[PDB]
């Protein structure tokens, strides 16, 4: 429950993401848009074509929020409270979509860091994502 081993595992893998962060973020989004087309609906004002600069820009933001969250695993609710209001109150993002983006991020990580994406690291990331997801939809609980 972001148990000691998980954090350390999470900090470690996000570490090798290091400076790729934003591009992984944007790739995770594009993967989500193409596999789960219902998701495109939240971004009417965006150009969601591959290459998209707006998606590249958005990806960077997504990636920065996760980096912070990792930097603050023991205090996520404080660290993500504003994004949680944004997502649940203003945008009303359906909770299922957080599982979709999480799945797409794991896919993007597996595709880019094969040597680091071990079963153990896959388990910890999955739990880190679930808990980031839990905080962001906490306004509906």
């Amino acid at each position: 429950v972001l148990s000691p081993a998980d954090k350390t595992n999470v900090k470690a893998a996000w570490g090798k993401v290091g400076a790729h962060a934003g591009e992984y973020g944007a790739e995770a989004l594009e993967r989500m848009f193409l596999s789960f087309p219902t998701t495109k609906t939240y971004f009417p004002h965006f150009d969601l074509s591959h290459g998209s600069a707006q998606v590249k820009g958005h990806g960077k933001k997504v990636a920065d929020a996760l980096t912070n969250a990792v930097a603050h695993v023991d205090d996520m609710p404080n660290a993500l409270s504003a994004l949680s209001d944004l997502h649940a109150h203003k945008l009303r993002v359906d909770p299922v979509n957080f599982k979709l983006l999480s799945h797409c991020l794991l896919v993007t990580l597996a595709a880019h860091l094969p040597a680091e994406f071990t079963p153990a690291v896959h388990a910890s990331l999955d739990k880190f994502l679930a808990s980031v997801s839990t905080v962001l939809t906490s306004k509906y609980r």
Binding site: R31, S35, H103, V107, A110, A111, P114, F117, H122
Partner: protein, 146 residues
Amino acid sequence: VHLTPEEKSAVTALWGKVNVDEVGGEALGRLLVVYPWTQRFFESFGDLSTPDAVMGNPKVKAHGKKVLGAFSDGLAHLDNLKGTFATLSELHCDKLHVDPENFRLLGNVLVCVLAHHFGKEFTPPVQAAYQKVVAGVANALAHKYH
């Protein structure tokens, strides 16, 4: 399942490069490590206590091969997934009592495992096509449950 002609082809090309002897033990083993309540159904498979214990477990790997064999079948019968998995469906419901939500998790772990193996070759549109295949299998496996 409805794939475009571009998708059928892409799915085919990638499947041909899959290592039958390993990817299935890898998917099943990551399912047991990431979603631990699934170990309940394999309690007699030996030591499942650590990620290495599960992954290198000979009975896990052996059983993973058969599971990948069934996916291969469905890939060969995309237009009749349902008739193809009817018996497996009865077995999973009637005899094993697996909740069908786990068929979706397994399909998603399989996608991560293809991404892990194929890297950049596993592009967003190819992932999208495999997402349709996996959901189509989870669906067909769930048919004899109600």
